[model samples]
Target: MTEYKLVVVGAGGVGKSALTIQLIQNHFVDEYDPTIEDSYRKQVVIDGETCLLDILDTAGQEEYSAMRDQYMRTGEGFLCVFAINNTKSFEDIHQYREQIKRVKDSDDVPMVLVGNKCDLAARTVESRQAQDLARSYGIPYIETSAKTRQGVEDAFYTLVREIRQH
Candidate 1:
């Protein structure tokens, strides 16, 4: 069976809530975390080429990067969220990325730079500038409001693209 591990991470009160919701059906770490998931499994979805995507809402539930250590090294991709209303959160994105990179012992990981609170027009972080920032990191950027459910679907599905790469 095919599978992917996606760990959503970001500052508090950002768009992290809506973008990667769902999937608490199982709450066990990768049994091996050593790549048993690479082989195969019969009880997977698709008919021919099935793929199981394991998405964990870590930063939210863990309460500020709990279990942050293990997650840093394993995920195939990350949803790095911040809010337009908070410029500091935007700058703090660097710390999250740095920690992940340092712990994972890898220079780069597939990531999506997200700016939440798009509904707020008085955004301290310019939308185009955020887009440029994502472009600078060579990843995708999206703005959403979890409360209003804006850009919810698109944000979740956008992560699918990153999975195939790893």
Candidate 2:
């Protein structure tokens, strides 16, 4: 089996876990608390190829910092998540990028900059700003909504496809 590690990361309430759950099970947890610690694993077949997906739905708490490094080091790719409605999440992209560099030790790792929770567009922080940031980093960007299942699968599949191409 071809196995791939995917890390979903962001600050509290950015919907990392929610996106992971939605991708794996097509189910969304509406009243989720960011304080919870959790992760999951599954297999997703794309283009008739079975890929083992080891997903790290990491906690946003400071205590999980070490685990974050471990996951990043081992990850085959990254999904750096930011809530569309939260500016702070987008602003933290620099910090997350630094962490990825430290752990992965390579800028070549496939990454997808995800602006999540797009279902709440009325509360959007800055869509254009986020796109520019992703462009500056030379990473693909998408606005995703786990609730409505929009761009959720695209985000994951696109990264996987990119990785395969490389």
Candidate 3:
């Protein structure tokens, strides 16, 4: 009946809201902004079992680098994301990994590396390079385009199972 928590993370305006908007429901919407740090909880079937999925839609505030602590800790599933058009966002992925490891006290975290806004086709980083980095980190590399809903739900489905397994 009850299950887990998920962390939606990445650089600001990396399309986190667009990707997880429908994932956010009534009573979850916050005051100030319609797109930042608004958390939602719901029930769903993941890995063949009913789960209470609590999603922490973290902010994309670029100026704040101190989110390393909040980046992890309670995350059972982590979506390490970056936009296809921003190489700067992709460059610091290793730091996110380090933060996860530090907070969880275990490197065996259930994680996925995501490149959103793939439909834009304005990629600054090469797919091969991103895949290579993902390969090195031993995680799956998924591309999501919220505009067309490509790989968006799939990311969550995949991560949910991965979390169940891990």
Candidate 4:
């Protein structure tokens, strides 16, 4: 048995909490409460092995940005998220990814590029664009709609598997 220290990183309004809540609580959180930071743990079986996922739902607001490096150093794997309907959020993924790599002092970090808000009918960021970026970073990409719970489990489970391999 092992515990995967998973971190969710993204710009504001990217549905990081909704995704985490959907995975842990099996429901959608519609209201946007800018998270300062939140942590949750769950024991589950992945690939026939029991493991604990210590998930850190990070604050995306600028006011709490200073606390990022502390968690980045401790996290074993990360879900780098962005909203498909928001172009700026998608554009901001690079900074988060770079900061994680810089703080961890490694290029081969366990990470996944997540495009949230997939249920939105109007998307500013195309799937190909996100996929291309993930491919360039050598990480897998997943599109999730926390409201509908689509790809929510797969997103978190994929990161856990990445940590296992790392």
Candidate 5:
């Protein structure tokens, strides 16, 4: 069986856990507590293709950095998330990408930059800055909304397809 492991990483309050829950279970929590450390694994089917997606939804706050680092080391791919409303989180991709490179042994692992909470585009902080950053890193980029299920599957399945093809 083909399996893909992905890590959703970003600064706290950027909605990594919400994105995971919305993608895997098609649900969202309006009052989610960002302090709780959590992760989830889910099997998903994309266009009749079956693949196991083990998602590490690490905590946004300070306490989980060690656990998050361990999870990043084992990830096969990455979904680097940033909220469109938060510029600081978007800017933190530099640090996040560096951390991934430091821990990931493979040079060719696929990564997808995801701008989450696009449903609130009017409050956008980074605009399409993710596209340029992803391009510079030689990865794909997409805007997604976990609440509306927008571009969530595409962001994940695109990375899976790219990884599988290579």
Candidate 6:
């Protein structure tokens, strides 16, 4: 079976692991660290093609940039994640975008802009802001709540489609 090596990149408390675990294990994880790395795999049928998804739920701290770049080097696709209720987290996604492009050495890499924690009542990062940002990058923007499992599969599967198209 074909495999897609996808990396989840974002700042701390952005729920990168929650999103990954929700998709892979169908369970919501509520925590993380500064340097720990976790990898997961799942097989699914996407657009009639059976493929394996190898996901890297990476460290989401400033100190892990060097380690992150290494994962970026091997990632076939990326989910640039941020929490919907956090303005600063939204700002951080832009930096992840830049880093991914810098390490990939191309603007054409497959990627998705993920807005997590959509189930929250208060929103600091408006949906319009995320949509415009995704437009600027020419990538898909998805709203997801790992707690509710909303848009979780769509976020990952969308990246798979982008990789296939690329």
Root-mean-square deviation (CA) per prediction? 7.9, 1.8, 3.5, 0.8, 1.9, 1.3
Q: Give Cα-based local distance difference scores for all models.
A: 0.63, 0.82, 0.76, 0.93, 0.79, 0.90
RMSD of candidate 1 to the truth, in angstroms, is 7.9
TM-score (all chains, Cα) for each model: 0.72, 0.90, 0.84, 0.97, 0.89, 0.95
| Model 5 lDDT per residue over 58-99, tens place | 766777566667767888788888888888888888888887
For model 3, the local distance difference test gives 0.76
* Candidate 3: count of backbone clashes, pairs at least 3 residues apart or interchain: 1
Best by lDDT: 4
Clashes found in each candidate (C-alpha, N, C closer than 3 A): 2, 0, 1, 0, 0, 0
Superposed by TM-score, candidate 3 places the C-alpha of residue 148 at a distance from the truth, in angstroms, of 1.5
Ranked by TM-score, the better of candidates 2 and 6 is 6
lDDT of 4 by residue, 63-129 (tens): 9776778877899999999999999998889999999999899999999999999999889999999
Clashes of 2: 0
Better of 4 and 6 by TM-score: 4
Higher-lDDT candidate of 3 and 6: 6
Residue pairs whose backbone atoms clash in candidate 5:
none
lDDT of 1 at 99: 71
Which numbered prediction scores highest in TM-score against the true structure? 4
Q: How big is the positional error of residue 16 in model 3, measured in Å on the Cα after superposition?
A: 1.6
Candidate 2 stretches with Cα past 4 Å from truth are 35-37
- Rank by lDDT (best first): 4, 6, 2, 5, 3, 1
Which residue pairs show collisions in model 6? none
How do the residues 1-166 of candidate 2 rate in per-residue lDDT, one tens digit apiece?
Answer: 9987788878878888889889988899899666444667888797799998888777666765556676567878888888888888888877887888888888777888999999895665677888789899888889899999999989988878767865
Residue 106, model 6, lDDT: 93
Question: Compared with the true structure, what per-residue lDDT tens digits does model 3 show for residues 69-131?
Answer: 664578898888888899988986787777778888998999889898898877897888889
